[PDB]
Symmetry: C5
Subunit: 164 residues, 5 copies
């Protein structure tokens, strides 16, 4: 049942990294689960676009010979893969305001530090870079030489949050 | 037909106990009814998240080796299983206002007294703890040494409600 | 194909007779049409509730041993089957205002006179009880000893309506 | 696959000719395409009504022995098939205002002149009756003894529209 | 499975080129993917229209003997294929305002220059006609005798955009 006919996943070019990555991951997981022979997914790729994207596909259809080239064309035309220094400045911009728990903040900061080139930064320097931008209410009790991985920091922050 | 492809049940991290319990129960009942071999449900778990949850899964995917560990990770990260005394204080907080029948109140108070540790409280002390927070209009006619289980209390309250 | 997996019929406890009767009729017609072996419909009844009803089912699940007991539990907990005299008073309350045709009024009055105990009232006394609460515009031309069943009254009212 | 289980076509009694005709045509085309043995469509007709129509069906279910009688009951109870002179007066009522092309006007006037009794009016008198109620901007250039069928009138009106 | 029964693509006559072209492309790709024997698609074409289009089909049904004639009737009645000079004037009308990247503008201008008669204009004159209507911020750095195809212009514009 790999006719790519019944799928409720869509895309319309909203120009943001998260929506594009969600769409690409959902398509590739669907192809891995239901079963496509890696050629029928090119003949039925036009059943998922709407609005501004369908005009783009009817424009640039004649430069797609495989599947990986089409997925690379989507990722290159709708995400310009931002350089190094703007990510660091955006990262140090925001502080952790009150009425915001640890889980949302740690999820957003770990989603931001994945657009750097891979293999440059291990876990310890990443946690040391994260630890400065936390509020005083947690930081009075969770001082260093006590955590080594993000799971322990999340656990102790959750205990200090739900305790009082 | 266990490809976990066609399912209209979703979750997006609303941070509440009831939505999480409803989602977990619906997934587990779907797996019991249609038929999954307990390994294909891990390869297709990513077809049910959207929004804030998909970034969380793309973050913490590498710490899930079975199915029960993933369901425990969901229940532990999105519900911090509140302690004993806050449930008792929240329970004695609200009184039963007028223009509210017995069924809604009894359903909410029985949904609240299930987050305690199991095996501490049987039925009689639970009904004796519930009986104080009822309005005078029912309580003038349904005096004690007449009911022993919640079905009889609901029945006599329904008769006194629909009679006049 | 009786896995009770794909069905777009739902219920959430709106506390009204018509919604409950519509939901029960749609479920029972679905079971008669597609084919269930009268035991699989109990294992998959939890795929149709949402919101306030799912907490109610997780509360009272342990008092359902068959299918008819579960359908009776729904009908008894969400409809208190109103007594005799309130139906008669509600029935004589409303008059037929202008800018309202015969079909809507006759449908509502025949939907109200079905909650009485069966076998007490035949067709002739029911039409004689209905005939008093009609407007003067129809009643100047449709005088008695001319109709015996509701079809003839609807037919002559429709002719007098669409004629002028 | 004729269980009349998966169909996204519905009806709720909006009291208009066009919605009823669309619903009847969609049901009959579905029965012609998928394959029903002309008896299973009566046992599953109750899976398509909602709201005010389901009470009507639970009222008048016991006067339907075949399929054509049920479709005639729908067409007779929800469309009173308007008489001759009101259609002619409604037809000559409206004129063709500016900022309205030929296609919409011709479609509406041909949809109105189908409720007359059939076999009374051929094509030539119908076009001669239509030609009076057109604006001066088209009528200065499309004078008679030049068109004989509606296709030619639509074609020359479209040329005069898109030319200037 | 070519009964044209389950399809979530619809059309209602919005009178625009893009919606009509999207609808025609989606239908033809569906027929190429799932499998129709080129005669069953005419018996089930009426399961996709709604509103104003269904009255049009019930009007003009008797002038469709094949599939290509029906698709040509749709394209001719709902798109009047605009002449040459209005496309050129509309094309030179708009300039590229700030806070608008290169991809959206190039997609719209390449979607507009496809309604001309084919075989008149190759790639070089098209890029030379496009290059005049760009803002000064890109045009200070991307001067000519450096690009020959639209891919290189998009690439250098994307580098100059995401660099500063």
């Amino acid at each position: 049942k790999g006719n790519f006919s019944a799928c409720t996943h869509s895309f319309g070019g909203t120009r943001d990294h998260d929506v594009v990555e969600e769409f690409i991951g959902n398509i590739e997981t669907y192809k891995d689960v239901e079963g496509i022979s890696d050629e029928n997914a090119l003949k039925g790729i036009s059943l998922l676009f709407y609005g501004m994207a369908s005009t783009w596909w009817q424009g640039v259809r004649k430069e797609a010979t495989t599947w990986k080239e089409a997925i690379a064309l989507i990722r290159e035309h709708f995400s310009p893969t931002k350089p190094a220094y703007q990510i660091y400045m955006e990262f140090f911009q925001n502080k952790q305001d009150d009425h915001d728990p640890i889980d949302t903040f740690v999820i957003q900061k770990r989603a931001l530090l994945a657009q750097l080139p891979s293999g440059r930064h291990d876990e310890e320097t990443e946690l040391d870079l994260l630890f400065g931008l936390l509020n005083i209410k947690y930081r009075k009790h969770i001082s260093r030489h006590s955590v080594h991985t993000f799971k322990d920091l999340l656990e102790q922050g959750r205990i200090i949050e739900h305790n009082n």
